From a paper:
Expanding this pattern to hpphhph can produce larger α-helical barrels. Here, we show that pentameric to nonameric barrels are accessed by varying the residue at one of the h sites. In peptides with four L/I–K–E–I–A–x–Z repeats, decreasing the size of Z from threonine to serine to alanine to glycine gives progressively larger oligomers. X-ray crystal structures of the resulting α-helical barrels rationalize this: side chains at Z point directly into the helical interfaces, and smaller residues allow closer helix contacts and larger assemblies.
Conversely, both Gly variants scored more favourably as larger oligomeric states: the a = d = Ile variant as an octamer; and a = Leu, d = Ile as a nonamer. The Gly@g variant with a = d = Ile unfolded at 38 °C and did not fully refold on cooling. Indeed, peptide sequences with a = d = Ile are more unstable than their a = Leu, d = Ile counterparts. Thus, β-branched Ile at both a and d maintains the open assembly even with Gly residues at g. Although a larger oligomer was predicted in silico, the calculated internal energies for Gly@g were similar for the different oligomers. The hexameric and heptameric assemblies of [name] imply that, whilst Gly@g is necessary to access larger states, it is not the only factor that dictates oligomer state of the helical assembly.
Author numbering:
A (entry chain A), D (entry chain A): 1 to 29
B (entry chain C), E (entry chain C): 1 to 28
C (entry chain B), F (entry chain B): 1 to 30
The structure:
Amino acid sequence: GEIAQGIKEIAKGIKEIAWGIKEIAQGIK
Amino acid sequence: GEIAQGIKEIAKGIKEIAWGIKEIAQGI
Amino acid sequence: GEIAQGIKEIAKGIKEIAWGIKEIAQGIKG
Amino acid sequence: GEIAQGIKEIAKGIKEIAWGIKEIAQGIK
Amino acid sequence: GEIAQGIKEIAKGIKEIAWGIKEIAQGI
Amino acid sequence: GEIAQGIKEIAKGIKEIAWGIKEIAQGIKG
């Protein structure tokens, strides 16, 4: 499904955002 | 299903983003 | 439902992100 | 609906995140 | 419906967040 | 669908946010 695909792509991007935010948080410390 | 799984994975990632944002806010 | 629960947990996390971003924005004012 | 309510609350929080990010972006300049 | 409207408003807010993040990245 | 379109536009914006966050993270390395 187009919706199923979109949700999968959002999940992937959110995982990448979570990683980058942790990098920023550690990089500020 | 696949949608239920995707929503669960998004919820998990958003919880992790919320924690990291709090760490940035405290770190600043 | 599992979807209903997931959406509720996303709403909760988004509220927490919104709070932290506001704290950062104010904290950059010093 | 619980889903309808959740989506409304997410939309509200995303609007607030958009505002705060713009504040940070301007505050960095 | 209400869900379709909410998803449209989320899409709009995410576009605005994407622009602001790019401004921060360029500003840094 | 309107929902299908909205989800696609969210996916696109989230990919762009992910890119910008990576740029910030690397840019904080200098």
